[PDB]
Write a protein that binds this ligand. Structure first.
Ligand SMILES: O=C(O)CNC(=O)C(=O)O
Ligand SMILES: [Mg+2]
Ligand code: NI
Ligand SMILES: [Zn+2]
Length: 331
């Protein structure tokens, strides 16, 4: 069995290996990368996503989200308070202001300590989930706006044509902006490219150990757990590495820098935070190995999780028994 300790693997594909996306994901899996839940891919030196980032300031962040925390430093929830629209140039200036800028620090580890110690006492503003792409149309390799669609994968595997589309999302972050513990919708893969700016630190639980995280979360968030049998689908709960270690939950951590891809694998719980102003792009995707995870994915039906149009068909075809209840939660 490859990668039996479930370590995060880092890959350095050549330009020739960077041509065929599906083949390279399958190669990574042949080496056990999926066992960690997360892998890093450093593009060949010849590759670029686009020529420059000098002309992105006029992108609009229609609904910036202020991430307000409740709880204790290592065990907290966050809610998103909607703010007035601002451009990327306005957001960058705000991120660099004295109120919001990254503090002085020695190294990534010192910054991580400061994050966990101090996050709850501040409310950073995240430009998340913005439909669009920063890949040049002429970039042919690993262009997240040109991937094979999940609807086409389900059709290829299972023979059923379904409605829906699959497009990327941009994330503009600042110091302390936070992504809560979650798996992807329908336990899909995700791929994330950090276009520019400061790093993003990730934490991940191996898929084979995901239920350990869920059980801890039910213990630590007992009101939430009574409200919903899949409340991590709400994407609001944070648990620190120190707390995970005290409770014996297997996990790993890694920092992504500008120019690097991360892939999350089916049912790989992940969480993390941004170091300072940055821009990432991400999209969900599927492979043949995903289908069995999609069939078994938990679902939120309490009404909180509210998701895209395209998840309808995945539930309807892969989870017909659950469909009626799940759709009530959507309506
Ligand atoms: O970058 C973020 O805020 C969150 N990203 C992801 O959860 C991902 O790419 O799967
Ligand atoms: Mg612009
Ligand atoms: Ni994710
Ligand atoms: Zn719910």
């Amino acid at each position: 069995a490859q990668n039996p300790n479930c370590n995060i693997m880092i890959f350095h594909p050549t330009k020739e290996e960077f041509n065929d996306f599906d083949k390279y994901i399958a190669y990574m899996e042949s080496q056990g990368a999926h066992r960690a839940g997360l892998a890093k891919i450093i593009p060949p030196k010849e590759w670029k996503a686009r020529e420059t980032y000098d002309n992105i300031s006029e992108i609009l962040i229609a609904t910036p989200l202020q991430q307000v925390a409740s709880g204790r430093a290592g065990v907290f929830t966050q809610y998103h308070k909607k703010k007035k629209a601002m451009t990327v140039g306005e957001y960058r200036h705000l991120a660099n202001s004295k109120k919001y800028q990254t503090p002085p620090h020695q190294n990534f580890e010192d910054l991580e300590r400061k994050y966990w110690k101090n996050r709850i006492y501040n409310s950073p503003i995240y430009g998340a989930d913005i439909s669009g792409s920063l890949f040049d149309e002429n970039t042919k390799q690993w262009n997240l706006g040109h991937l094979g669609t999940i609807q086409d994968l389900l059709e290829k595997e299972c023979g059923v044509v379904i409605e829906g589309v699959n497009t990327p999302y941009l994330y503009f972050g600042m110091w302390k902006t936070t992504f809560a513990w979650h798996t992807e919708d329908m336990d899909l893969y995700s791929i994330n490219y950090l276009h520019l700016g400061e790093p993003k630190t990730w934490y991940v639980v191996p898929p084979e150990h995901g239920q350990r995280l869920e059980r801890l979360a039910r213990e630590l968030f007992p009101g939430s757990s009574r409200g919903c049998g899949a409340f991590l689908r709400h994407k609001v709960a944070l648990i620190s590495p120190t707390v995970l270690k005290e409770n014996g939950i297997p996990f790993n951590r890694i920092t992504q820098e500008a120019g690097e891809f991360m892939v999350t694998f089916p049912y790989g719980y992940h969480a993390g935070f941004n170091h300072g102003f940055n821009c990432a792009e991400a999209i969900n995707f599927a492979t043949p190995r995903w289908i069995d995870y999609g069939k078994m994915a938990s679902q939120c039906s309490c009404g909180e999780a509210r998701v895209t149009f395209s998840m309808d068909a995945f539930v309807r075809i892969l989870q017909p028994e659950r469909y009626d209840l799940w759709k009530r939660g959507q309506d």
